[PDB]
């Protein structure tokens, strides 16, 4: 019983936080979340608005707002992301899912 989550990042090149940070060179003025937090949480910027995708699970998120925690949003929407899980642990993700 049970298929396994594949281990390959959706976008291995964006596996680097530094490179993910570069993607936010045009992260909008009206956008309310710091790129550093987004890049740290595995997200890189796509498009020209405020859309991001996780380099690993490819979870796509937009409509970012003051206070929005990237790591939390990550756990909220993409709880099985192996990047999120290695970085924040099983406890953290469960803690976000159970609320
Ligand atoms: Zn992810």
Curated annotation (Swiss-Prot):
Reported effect, residue 68 to A: Abolishes inhibition of caspases, SMAC binding and anti-apoptotic activity
Post-translational modification remark: Autoubiquitinated and undergoes proteasome-mediated degradation. The truncated protein (tLivin) not only loses its anti-apoptotic effect but also acquires a pro-apoptotic effect.
Protein keywords: Apoptosis, Cytoplasm, Golgi apparatus, Metal-binding, Nucleus, Protease inhibitor, Thiol protease inhibitor, Transferase, Ubl conjugation, Ubl conjugation pathway, Zinc, Zinc-finger
Effect seen on changing residue 54 to A: Abolishes inhibition of caspases and anti-apoptotic activity
GO cellular component: centrosome; cytoplasm; cytosol; Golgi apparatus; nucleoplasm; nucleus
Localisation per UniProt entry: Nucleus; Cytoplasm; Golgi apparatus
Superkingdom to which the source organism belongs: Eukaryota
Entry text on domains: The RING domain is essential for autoubiquitination.
Sequence similarity: Belongs to the IAP family.
Protein name: Baculoviral IAP repeat-containing protein 7
Residues of the full protein shown: 71 to 169 of 298
